[PDB]
Design a protein around this ligand. Structure first.
Ligand SMILES: Nc1ncnc2c1ncn2[C@H]1CC[C@@H](COP(=O)(O)OP(=O)(O)OP(=O)(O)O)O1
Ligand SMILES: OC[C@H]1O[C@@](CO)(O[C@H]2O[C@H](CO)[C@@H](O)[C@H](O)[C@H]2O)[C@@H](O)[C@@H]1O
Ligand SMILES: [Mg+2]
Ligand SMILES: [Mg+2]
Lengths: 556, 412
DNA sequence: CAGTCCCTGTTCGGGCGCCG
DNA sequence: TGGTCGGCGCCCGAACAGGGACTG
């Protein structure tokens, strides 16, 4: 019985018909070797590590990185080849806790487990595959080979095994203490109660004894008796919370990697700081080869970056969640398919903020994007609070009613009210349901030659108006749109248009206000200027009316 | 202490790995309460991350129930068990069930908990319970018995089920019973009161065998279809005839006897859309002959047991929805319309959800299958809301389509 | 009646940010 | 020195699916 057993282990098979890792160690510099050898030798006395005879035919590289904000070093074993061949697990970490989720508590304790990975036993049969060879100051001394007796940093089964093991240990305590809140994220524990501060600390220490029984040690050094607590990158105060300060690079010359950090920082910032915009900064990253390449900032990304920094200038903070009061989400349109939102309960006291900028579709409008933002907020809210907020939306009740009733897709927004904060979201134009009496009827068509990429777009009308236009470097689709554009240009404020293009009719009937295609944008521009447009569809090549005549013209 | 029937996945197919989606606080609370009791009774037990399979779980309230029902989305598992519940232990379909004046649906899901489940198979029934704001990691379980909503459950229990049924079946030979997953379809031609009474008898009959039943009533004979219809107009504008020709031309992919020649003649010029066009006698007769053909059935449309059912739905506005069930394109086994459903004029998603359920129910009664739905909705819109309005114990297959409607062929 | 080409939308893996 | 794991978020681009129109 050379090694003791502390807590229940997790069976871990290899992927079937596959064998343990073999790969030679790195040429590690002696400076790192000093740090590694001292800690690694200590492990054997505890029982974390064991010596192995050459009967163990497995070798895997090893390396070390300094603990951030500490002099200590972190001991990590590269298991990339072992991961590849190790059985798949099901991750039990389904997301990240957000402080806006937290309810107010009278007493809050944050405590961190020490050597959390090294306090959880690895599977006995699986221990052999860990084997790695230590290095020496010279290449003469071989260095001992070691197999882990506990979870090792760098494996792919470590987080899930620890989290599941931690939950099993915590579960008896929680059942005995139904009114204690324990937020368990990896080894960090957040403990909150409405118990008075003296009684709360009694439970806190009593919980520490419970974790001690299973070999889990909570050092005082990482204990956080007193606010403001540092938790998941946030600063927690009795009645408010905020993000730990974010440093934005100041570089005078920006590379590609530069913008990524910036962008990724601003996304983290936008959870509380209202109105962060990354659109123009992200425009710089599209279709670039090298992460190292240097790129100059446009006057758009510069102006953007300027007001983004100024938002960070003033300190902001969020509040906590009061289950008694309603949840309210308000959304503002920021232009260029950019939307920001605030979730709150008391007016002007925000739980959190956020943005929805995703451009979805080649042709779209503001109503679709607002519906997308509402959905993104709803799912986010259900994660954090388990309910859907009431919505305050910058869209008239009649605008929304007109859109969803007429749209051919099922669409819906949950309970919401109108807020009159401009810019309001509206439909820029409306297609007529019935043909317009006394309006000129334009029969439009276009065709193009697949080989030459040459084509014609034209129309014929009941009044005798006619046009045919030659086009270069086009497609059948593009000429069918062009024909419609021509009819809109050359018509009065009211016009009936008959097309046989399903492509064009589908784009235009969805009432888009923005498009990737400039041609569609120009069609939109004209539709907005009209008083009445009736679009109608007929099947091609059926000998119908004007459609037959215009088909002949453009085919020529 | 019952023998456990061994089960295997379809060859070359691994188990389901499907992430758990976020749940509302009420559903999470209901699931935690439901699973706590189920663990104490031994139906499920907690499991570790070493199991690499997961299936989504959530809770529903059946129509008017007010009492939460656990529901597992086993579609992925059921697809990987598929050969089992078809090739071997499957159920025949009573072609007469659709003919009965009344059909009641009973939730016998509880019965499945009696039988135990093959120890080797339980690794595939894993499901994770989420926590609000990720306070805790996911609490994983797996099934020790026959799970509700799995397609092996009614097949393994069919031997047990028939013996319980058999005294009741002998007492009433005429009555027809069909079993689809957790549900028992009981179709009688009796009068309403006698019918309801016999259901209580089959309830008690189920009770003395140890089964609780928490009544969905159908009248499959009332069910009708929705024919393609052509408008009746005193006068026709050029636009009306253009719409009519387009609708008829599309219809000719279904009824090959449709002819547009005489109706096309009416639009030879280049005419204003609102210009009134008198119909000729030749066009009147062509239009008359067409309306008759549309009353007729399509030639050679018959159900094929091998082929999958496909359902398409269209949103017609004003609370009206149209659907077509088929296996081959343009060979439609049924076409229908739904109006004034729950959520009409206020919620498209609630209405679409109700529509999917009704269509699936009809397919179960008529063919003992569930169709694959082509849903006229955006993937993110459907996934966000659909569980809120779901009141059935099964879950059909669906895909998402965005077809703008050139012509309103199915509706008017 | 296949086979393309347009055109659109989805998915998935890459980078970064953040948390252990 | 360059180098590990899991989770979540964003924004990207490439690779893939599929529906119509048209070409033989
Ligand atoms: N860069 C990384 N790579 C792999 N695993 C990591 C990691 N960073 C954290 N983890 C995982 C590994 C375990 C856990 C590390 O948390 P602590 O930083 O607190 O190190 P601990 O062992 O707890 O020492 P203590 O300071 O508590 O005494 O998260
Ligand atoms: O609806 C899309 C959604 O399907 C998931 C589960 O939410 O897959 C399930 O539903 C599909 C469509 O019916 C089935 O084909 C599939 O077998 C079933 O597991 C998602 O991962 C996907 O986003
Ligand atoms: Mg720690
Ligand atoms: Mg044409």
């Amino acid at each position: 019985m050379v090694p003791i057993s502390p807590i229940e282990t997790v069976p871990v098979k290899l992927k079937p018909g596959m064998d343990g890792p073999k790969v030679k160690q790195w040429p590690l510099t002696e400076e790192k070797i000093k740090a590694l050898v001292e800690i690694c030798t200590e492990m054997e006395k505890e029982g974390k590590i064991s010596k192995i005879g050459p009967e163990n035919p497995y070798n895997t590289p090893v390396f070390v990185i300094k603990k951030k904000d500490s002099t200590k070093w972190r001991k990590l074993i590269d298991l990339r080849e072992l991961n590849k061949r190790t059985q798949d697990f099901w991750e039990v970490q389904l997301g990240i806790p957000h402080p806006a989720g937290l309810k107010k508590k009278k007493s809050v304790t944050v405590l961190d487990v020490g050597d959390a990975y090294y306090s959880v036993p690895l599977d006995e049969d699986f221990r052999k595959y860990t084997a790695f060879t230590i290095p020496s100051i010279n290449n003469e001394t071989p260095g001992i080979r070691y197999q882990y007796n506990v979870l090792p940093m760098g494996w792919k089964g470590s987080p899930a095994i620890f989290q599941s093991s931690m939950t099993k240990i915590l579960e008896p305590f929680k059942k005995q203490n139904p009114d204690i809140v324990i937020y368990q994220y990896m080894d960090d524990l957040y403990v909150g109660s409405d118990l008075e501060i003296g009684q709360h600390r009694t439970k806190i220490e009593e919980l520490r004894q419970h974790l001690l029984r299973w070999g889990l040690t909570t050092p005082d050094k990482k204990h956080q008796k007193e606010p403001p607590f540092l938790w998941m990158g946030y600063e927690l105060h009795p009645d408010k919370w905020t993000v730990q300060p974010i440093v934005l690079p100041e570089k005078d010359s920006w590379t590609v990697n530069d913008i990524c950090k910036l962008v990724g920082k601003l996304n983290w910032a936008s959870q509380i700081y209202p109105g962060i915009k990354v659109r123009q900064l992200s425009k710089l990253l599209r279709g670039t080869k090298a992460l190292t390449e240097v790129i100059p900032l446009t006057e758009e990304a510069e102006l953007e970056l300027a007001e983004n920094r100024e938002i960070l200038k003033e300190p902001v903070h969020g509040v906590y969640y009061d289950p008694s009061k309603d949840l309210i989400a308000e959304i503002q349109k920021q232009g260029q398919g950019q939307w920001t939102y605030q979730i709150y309960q008391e007016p002007f006291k925000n739980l959190k903020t956020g943005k929805y900028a995703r451009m979805r579709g080649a042709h779209t409008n503001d109503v679709k994007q607002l519906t997308e933002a509402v959905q993104k907020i709803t799912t986010e809210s259900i994660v954090i609070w388990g309910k859907t907020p009431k919505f305050k939306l910058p869209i008239q009740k009649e605008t929304w009613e007109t859109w969803w009733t007429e749209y051919w897709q099922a669409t819906w927004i949950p309970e919401w009210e109108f807020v009159n904060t401009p810019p309001l979201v509206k439909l820029w134009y409306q297609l007529e349901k019935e043909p317009i009496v006394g309006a000129e009827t334009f029969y439009v068509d276009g065709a193009a030659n697949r080989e030459t990429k040459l084509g014609k777009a034209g129309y014929v009308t009941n009044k005798g108006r006619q046009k045919v236009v030659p086009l270069t470097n086009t497609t059948n689709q593009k000429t069918e749109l062009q024909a419609i554009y021509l009819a809109l240009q050359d018509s009065g404020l009211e016009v009936n248009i008959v097309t046989n293009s399903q492509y064009a009719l589908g784009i235009i009937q969805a009432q888009p206000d923005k498009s990737e295609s400039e041609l569609v944008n120009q069609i939109i521009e004209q539709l907005i200027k009209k008083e009445k447009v009736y679009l109608a569809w007929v099947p091609a090549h059926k000998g119908i009316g004007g459609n037959e005549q215009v088909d002949k013209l453009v085919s020529a | 202490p019952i023998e456990t029937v061994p089960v295997k996945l379809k060859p070359g197919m691994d188990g389901p790995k499907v992430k758990q989606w976020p749940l509302t606080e009420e559903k999470i609370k209901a699931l935690v309460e439901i699973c706590t009791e189920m663990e104490k009774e031994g139906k499920i037990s907690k499991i570790g991350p070493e199991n690499p399979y997961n299936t989504p779980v959530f809770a529903i309230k059946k129509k008017d129930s007010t009492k939460w029902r656990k529901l597992v989305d086993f579609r992925e598992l059921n697809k990987r068990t598929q050969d089992f519940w078809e090739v071997q232990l499957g159920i025949p379909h009573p072609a007469g069930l659709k003919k009965k004046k009344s059909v009641t649906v009973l939730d016998v899901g509880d019965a499945y908990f009696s039988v135990p489940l093959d120890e080797d198979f339980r690794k595939y029934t894993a499901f994770t319970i989420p926590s609000i704001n990720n306070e805790t990691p996911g609490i994983r379980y797996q099934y020790n018995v026959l799970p509700q909503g799995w397609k092996g459950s009614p097949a393994i229990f069919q031997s047990s089920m028939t013996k319980i049924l058999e005294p009741f079946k002998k007492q009433n030979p005429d009555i027809v019973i069909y079993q689809y997953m957790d549900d028992l379809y009981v179709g009688s031609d009796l009068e309403i009161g006698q019918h309801r009474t016999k259901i209580e008898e089959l309830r008690q009959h189920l009770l003395r065998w140890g089964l609780t039943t928490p009544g969905y009533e159908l009248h499959p004979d009332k069910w009708t279809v929705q024919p393609i219809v052509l408008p009746e107009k005193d006068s026709w504008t050029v636009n009306d005839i253009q719409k009519l020709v387009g609708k008829l031309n599309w219809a000719s992919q279904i009824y090959p006897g449709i002819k547009v020649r005489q109706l096309s003649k009416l639009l030879r010029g280049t005419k204003a859309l609102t210009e009134v066009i008198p119909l000729t006698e030749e066009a009147e007769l062509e239009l008359a002959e067409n309306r008759e053909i549309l009353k007729e059935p399509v030639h050679g449309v018959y159900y094929d047991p091998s082929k999958d059912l496909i359902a398409e739905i269209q949103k017609q506005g004003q609370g009206q929805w149209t659907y077509q069930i088929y296996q081959e394109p343009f060979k439609n086994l049924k076409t229908g319309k739904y109006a004034r459903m729950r959520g009409a004029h206020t919620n498209d998603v609630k209405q679409l959800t109700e529509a999917v359920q009704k269509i699936t129910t009809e397919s179960i009664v008529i063919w003992g299958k569930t169709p694959k739905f082509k849903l006229p909705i955006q993937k993110e819109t459907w996934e966000t809301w659909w569980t809120e309005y779901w009141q059935a114990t099964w879950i059909p297959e669906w895909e998402f389509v965005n077809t703008p409607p050139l012509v309103k062929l199915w509706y008017q």
